[PDB]
Design a binder for this molecule. Structure first.
Ligand code: HEM
Ligand code: NA
Ligand code: NA
Ligand code: NA
Ligand code: NA
Length: 182
């Protein structure tokens, strides 16, 4: 089942409100044709260059950042082009990205919320339709809708009274979330 970790700062927020606010603030990095700039809006893989156990990206306008964890593969120019696929186990959101391949991994100096045990897997053949791609490219583009939909389904699978409209504290009481210090 999904497992959520949240800073106590967000105890009274709904998951949906938190994600809407976080993604709007992170913004759209404009990772799109004619606009990709290495070291600005590509993000990076650990160990990389285009595959690994983590993909991480900092916003182009602030130190907000996320880390996707699992067993990830980015096709780049290979068919189907520009597809992130593989196994997505976790998404961590916060600010102040640290580390990288040369450090052995990425971390957030302020990790606000993480969603783990997501159990998502997308085959290469689905291309940019795959859930993994939609979740992560959504975040890159300042749009948490795809992530929200996957979290909502995972919460319903625990109990249909649980949803992204639950607060983090409600989810803790329901056995799927735990608080961390602010
Ligand atoms: C890991 C998550 C990533 C996702 C979900 C993603 C997604 C995409 C998407 C949707 C496009 C647009 C394709 C098109 O419309 O033609 C694209 C283009 C591109 N991506 Fe990514 N990308 C990711 C990572 C990276 C990384 C790590 C690099 C390089 C270090 C990269 C380099 C490029 C380049 C060079 C283009 C084409 C830009 C151009 O045509 O001018 N991407 N990517
Ligand atoms: Na490739
Ligand atoms: Na496939
Ligand atoms: Na269900
Ligand atoms: Na509850």
């Amino acid at each position: 089942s999904i497992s959520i970790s949240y800073s106590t700062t967000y105890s009274g927020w709904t998951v949906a409100d938190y994600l809407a606010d976080w993604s709007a603030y992170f913004g759209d990095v404009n990772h799109a044709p004619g606009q990709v700039v290495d070291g600005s809006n590509t993000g990076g893989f650990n160990p990389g260059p285009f595959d690994g156990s983590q993909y991480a990206l900092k916003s182009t306008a602030s130190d907000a950042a996320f880390i996707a964890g699992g067993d990830l593969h980015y096709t780049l120019f290979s068919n189907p082009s520009h597809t992130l696929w593989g196994k997505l186990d976790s998404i961590a959101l916060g600010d102040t990205l640290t580390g990288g391949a040369s450090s052995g991994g990425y971390a957030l100096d302020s990790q606000e919320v993480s969603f783990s045990n997501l159990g998502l897997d997308s085959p290469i053949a689905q291309g940019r339709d795959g859930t993994v791609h939609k979740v992560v490219y959504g975040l890159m583009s300042g749009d948490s809708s795809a992530l929200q939909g996957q979290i909502d389904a995972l919460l319903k699978a625990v109990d249909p009274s649980l949803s992204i409209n639950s607060t983090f504290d409600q989810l803790a009481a329901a056995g799927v979330a735990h608080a961390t210090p602010a």
